[model samples]
Target: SMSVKKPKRDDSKDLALCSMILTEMETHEDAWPFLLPVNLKLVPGYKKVIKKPMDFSTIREKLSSGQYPNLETFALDVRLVFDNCETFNEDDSDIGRAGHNMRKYFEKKWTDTFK
Candidate 1:
């Protein structure tokens, strides 16, 4: 499973970007803390491509054979997850454990998402 580095469903037009996409997939990785085993995370282009029921079968097949990706490269894949999880857009309440610790990571570094 580790042999695979990118999912076939990714159409990022770059191999490395595809690797990032794979990281976000609910199948290979869970970028978000979903509520249930049935809490399905949708692939980015699911509706745009598979508008027909029979065509949905192709979607399942592609997902089943997708490649495993790494968190390092897959971080970009989890952008939506990180955006929702980091609580950046929401009010800060006791953020970063009373701001006593973890403050550094919460702030923007040149490479961090907050930047």
Candidate 2:
């Protein structure tokens, strides 16, 4: 078996980026624009699981509750918000592109902060 050594995580950087993301959410009206909230009635089973509107509030609750161990885990939560969206669209739709853009933004922010 091969043993791999993972790089150490930096709390200061993670916390800083988290704070920045929160502030960005508040400042921008179109924050998480890609992960649009869905109309439960339009999407089956969406009403039961997606109780709250898809927004920064999920991240906020997790952050405040100390549920996430790191930024990557937190990021997964962010990605899921859109990936599991109630709305359906074609592959080439503008809305689809926006979803990818949202992930790209997250990647860029993490890279820029580390590098």
Instruction: Give the number of the best model, judged by TM-score.
Output: 2
- Provide the clashing-pair count of each candidate structure: 0, 0
On lDDT, the leading prediction is 2
lDDT of 2 at 21: 71
Segments of candidate 2 deviating more than 4 angstroms: 1-9, 25-39, 45-54, 85-87
lDDT of 2 by residue, 14-41 (tens): 7667768766544543454533456567
Q: Model 1 shows how many backbone clashes? A: 0
For model 1, residues 1-115, the per-residue Cα lDDT tens digits are 6787665643343444433333323332221232121122554543353332221123224334553243332333233233333432223544323222222322232134212
> Which portions of model 1 miss their true places by more than 4 Å?
1-64, 67-73, 86-115
After best superposition, candidate 2 residue 46: deviation in angstroms?
Answer: 3.7
Worst 10 residues of 1 by lDDT: 31-40
Least accurate 10 contiguous residues by lDDT in model 2: 27-36
